[PDB]
């Protein structure tokens, strides 16, 4: 998909083996914010959302929270609180045939800055503050949707980089996607199974200190009332 309409894909009810993506054919960058690229294997997540779009090798650094530029504030903006991974790889063989196969429409201008996680489909004409455009595109009336214009003989800063952005959410709901390790709640305690009142929608319990004190058993619906290990002064 193009940059102005990036594909948002929902995945669920599957085990995600991230390790094969971690070590594979050469990805140009692997920058994970708020999630360890190494320790990701023993994790469970509540939702995984992919953002597939194609950019050049120059503005890959702009796909990161906290910076501005030409694309990060006009086409795709990540939140300041961002827990996710960014991937990118060269696509000189899969794309960029000679002749300008530019179905890579990206928006040039926007009225104001972009709030995070927003797509723009409408192709209305740009600002024209002095003279209203009135639906024409003669002069001082630019079509904001722009083709990238890729060539296979271009420089290394002008190569199509297929960018997939994965966004997760950590330990705040029932988890549907997990790692390859043989409901994702991890901790240390003593199982003291009792009759806690399970409401039909409940999935975890919490104490006064906002820590885990009761955990729903992943197989059966009874309650594992966890208890911290016995300790004291000697």
């Amino acid at each position, epitope marked *: 998909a193009s940059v102005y309409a990036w594909n948002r894909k929902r995945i669920s009810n599957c085990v995600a083996d991230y390790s094969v993506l971690y070590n594979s054919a050469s990805f140009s960058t692997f920058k994970c914010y708020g999630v360890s690229p190494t320790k990701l294997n023993d994790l469970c997540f509540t939702n995984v959302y992919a953002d597939s779009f194609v950019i050049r090798g120059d503005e890959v650094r702009q796909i990161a929270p906290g910076q501005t530029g030409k694309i990060a504030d006009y086409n795709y903006k990540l939140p300041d609180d961002f827990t996710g991974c960014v991937i990118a790889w060269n696509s000189n063989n899969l794309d960029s045939k000679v002749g300008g196969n530019y179905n890579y429409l990206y928006r040039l201008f926007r009225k104001s800055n972009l709030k995070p996680f927003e797509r723009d489909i409408s192709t209305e004409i740009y600002q024209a503050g002095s003279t209203p455009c009135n639906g*024409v595109e*003669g002069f001082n009336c630019y079509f904001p949707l722009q083709s990238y214009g890729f060539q296979p003989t271009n420089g290394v800063g002008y190569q199509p980089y297929r960018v997939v952005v994965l966004s997760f959410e950590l330990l705040h709901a029932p988890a549907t996607v997990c790692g390859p390790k043989k409901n994702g709640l991890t901790g240390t305690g003593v199982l003291t199974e009792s009759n806690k009142k399970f409401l039909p929608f409940q999935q975890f319990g919490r104490d006064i200190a906002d820590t885990t004190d009761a955990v729903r058993d992943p197989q059966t619906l009874e309650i594992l009332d966890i208890t911290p290990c016995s300790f004291g002064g000697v």
Partner: antibody
Amino acid sequence: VQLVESGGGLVQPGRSLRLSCAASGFNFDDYAMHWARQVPGKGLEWVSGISGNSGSVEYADSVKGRFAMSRDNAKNSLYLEMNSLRTEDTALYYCAKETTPWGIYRSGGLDVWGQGTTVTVSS
Amino acid sequence: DIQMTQSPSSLSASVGDRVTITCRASQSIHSFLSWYQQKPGKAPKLLINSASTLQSGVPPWFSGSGSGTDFTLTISSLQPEDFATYYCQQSYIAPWTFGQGTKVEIK
């Protein structure tokens, strides 16, 4: 791609002197045709321009309301009407077609250049 | 509009050295600029479009870059067939303006 200009000559400032730039070797499309001028001895200046689906005419800052434009795509010829001439208009006129008739990014045109007719406005 | 200024107004260089040419806009211009070359008594020819894209028929020793307002242009090695004048031209808004010129001569 060949651009042939004609119509220039000696003219007292005040009367009309109509010129034309012939367009040949150019397929019919929605390219934007612009004018250009240059007084000898220094750099260049831009005069006018016409884009697709008619209308959309514009001139430079100090030449408002004294030139007239008409484009005929059937004859493949360009017409500019001269009115209210002054002494500073002595230049050689250049015609450009800018050769990027794509719906996305029509601007940033590669200004082609013909031979260029010369107008001598002497008092 | 747009007030276009260029520096320096004149220069002298030999064959094979390094010369930097810069133009400066009065406002945001992003990247809509063109690099032009003008021999005396000859037709113009575009070299660099949008300040970073090479044109067809131009060998890659002409390299220009820049963003925002201030720009730059770096010549890798000079030849006997480049001693001419230079201007900056934009394509943003209501009537465009050219540069004032910069001449390079034999020293």
